[PDB]
Design a protein around this ligand. Structure first.
Ligand SMILES: *CCC(=O)N(C[C@@H]1CCNC1=O)NC(=O)[C@H](CC1CCCCC1)NC(=O)[C@@H](NC(=O)OCc1ccccc1)[C@@H](C)OC(C)(C)C
Ligand SMILES: *CCC(=O)N(C[C@@H]1CCNC1=O)NC(=O)[C@H](CC1CCCCC1)NC(=O)[C@@H](NC(=O)OCc1ccccc1)[C@@H](C)OC(C)(C)C
Lengths: 301, 301
């Protein structure tokens, strides 16, 4: 038992991290087969990246993979990411995919500096398309990912920090999550909301782990739940959410709509100085998947 | 910015995990050079492990490393761990050390099942020498570790779960942390306490990240702080603790004893529906080291 914020084993991604240096900008890149993916603002000198990139040669890009100099033989820009074609394919390339995730979905982040991984933690893509990460200078280019058996599904590359200390970035094809753009002009996060289906998943995790104090005899309609949810800045719960929580409902014997009644009362009354899973807040960065994976034992390799 | 519960990159340990099977017991083992380390209760059939181990041959131990059968050519028992000598040294062996940590020190856990890593999270060794982990059937043999530049310092191997859902285990030389023994007889955790120096470190992390609301104009003596600390089930703070928090004190300009005054008032008055670092509880599983590493940028390779 127990319940922890669990990242995927990072080793398959660690063997892909590289340093990309050109001019006075150094950042992290991601080396899969013979391409190195990195944020496009590595390009030298309110920017126009087309104009800036036609002015560069291959030999301007210094790519260090360990103690080895990688030779750039081609380059192209796709959205906000640069793709540097190197003369060597990465022997540690895992089976992988590029995936653009939906808000509410979680992933693991391997924080890197100078192509050297520093730590791994678990994140969610917030409803306003930021992540509450942990990132310092030089972290851009670090990626977020999920692993499914033997396949790394990369879903995030880090670019910037917003004034409120949250983080914005792109999928691996360079498309920002949310309305953000890669230039140092005024922009800010939209107002965020709580990921309701995830909170319910976490409540089910509590029940699986022996915590029951927050349950009740009440029930509620989907409509009536959403009316109280909206009041507490929670995302609406759809029938689709209900269906994903099906198998957790069936493991525990608590109908989804019964767990909604318990959540409703938690919102209306607070937790009164009690904790759920060692937390005094309702936690919303576990998906229904995350819960099932951690309380059944699904490994990856 | 931001502040996350950050585990070390796990890749260096993932390449050491193996399956150890003998009789009807299968668990995880740790393959460094030509030895496989695993919990001794893999031994067949209130136990007497000497007697049980003299009755086994090498060919009773099935060790799977990937799709490869490892051949056991020797075995020895050291405390509660078994050391299986295999005919092949692990080519992915990192630079490493075996270290027995003090309570309050944190580490990363790579949860494994059948020699296949499942996830990584960060833990602390509680003052009562348990860890609040996340572990299912077949997780014993999973290790906890720290990384310092290029060196893995293994400090924990997992053995058992206690009735309260916390976890007990050994160092890599087989010595249990705490008073626990590896047999299925009544035993339970001592009463735990909060790791005071870690809570203070986390408060400094809050200040580094821009949170200041909990500070105050008051100050306090070391003695007077410990008198209120003891009342709230906190560990005593020693002058040695004070000195470790030195460099965090100097980064922030808040004398250690001034941060103690702020902690004192937090304990006496609660947090009044505010949060520190997205937490509504005082968090005690970050060491002063962890904070400095995460808010300065120390990498490892
Ligand atoms: C690529 C370098 C890098 O690692 N990184 C990550 C952030 C540094 C600190 N924490 C991080 O996660 N990105 C950057 O530093 C950005 C570099 C820009 C170069 C030009 C194209 C866009 C990326 N800069 C930022 O992330 C800044 N944020 C920002 O400019 O937001 C828009 C904005 C501009 C002006 C006013 C208000 C908002 C950060 C570093 O600046 C602050 C505000 C966080 C201090
Ligand atoms: C090695 C198998 C394994 O993965 N594992 C880890 C735990 C399983 C579930 N969560 C875990 O972390 N260890 C075991 O399952 C233990 C096997 C024992 C074999 C003989 C030598 C000692 C290890 N068993 C336990 O951890 C049990 N705990 C236990 O027996 O505690 C002492 C005790 C005995 C009797 C009464 C009260 C306390 C667990 C699995 O049993 C419960 C109580 C947690 C259900």
């Amino acid at each position: 038992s127990g319940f922890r914020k669990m990242a995927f084993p990072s080793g398959k991604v660690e063997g892909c991290m590289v340093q990309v240096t050109c001019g006075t900008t150094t950042l992290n890149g991601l080396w899969l087969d013979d391409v190195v993916y990195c944020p496009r603002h590595v390009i030298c000198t309110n920017p126009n990246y087309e104009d800036l990139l036609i002015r560069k040669s291959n030999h301007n890009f210094l790519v260090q993979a360990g103690n080895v100099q990688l030779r750039v033989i081609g380059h192209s820009m796709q959205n906000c990411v640069l793709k540097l074609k190197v003369d060597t394919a990465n022997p540690k390339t895992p089976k992988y995919k590029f995936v653009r995730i939906q808000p509410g979905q979680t992933f693991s982040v391997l924080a890197c500096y100078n192509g050297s991984p520093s730590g791994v933690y678990q994140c969610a893509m917030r409803p306003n398309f930021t992540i509450k990460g942990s990132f310092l200078n030089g972290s851009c280019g670090s990626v977020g990912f999920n692993i499914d058996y033997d396949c790394v599904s990369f879903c995030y590359m880090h670019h910037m920090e917003l004034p409120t200390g949250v983080h914005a970035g792109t999928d691996l094809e360079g498309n920002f999550y949310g309305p953000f753009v890669d230039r140092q002009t005024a922009q800010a996060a939209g107002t965020d909301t709580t990921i309701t289906v995830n909170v319910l998943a976490w409540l089910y995790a509590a029940v699986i782990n022996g915590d029951r104090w927050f349950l009740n005899r009440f029930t509620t309609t989907l409509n009536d739940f959403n009316l109280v949810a909206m009041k507490y800045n929670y995302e609406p719960l759809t029938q689709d959410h209900v269906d994903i929580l099906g198998p957790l409902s069936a493991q525990t014997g608590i109908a989804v709509l019964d767990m909604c009644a318990s959540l409703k009362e938690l919102l209306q009354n607070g937790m009164n100085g009690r904790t759920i899973l060692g937390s005094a807040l309702l936690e919303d960065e576990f998906t229904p998947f995350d819960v099932v994976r951690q309380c059944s034992g699904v490994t990856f390799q």
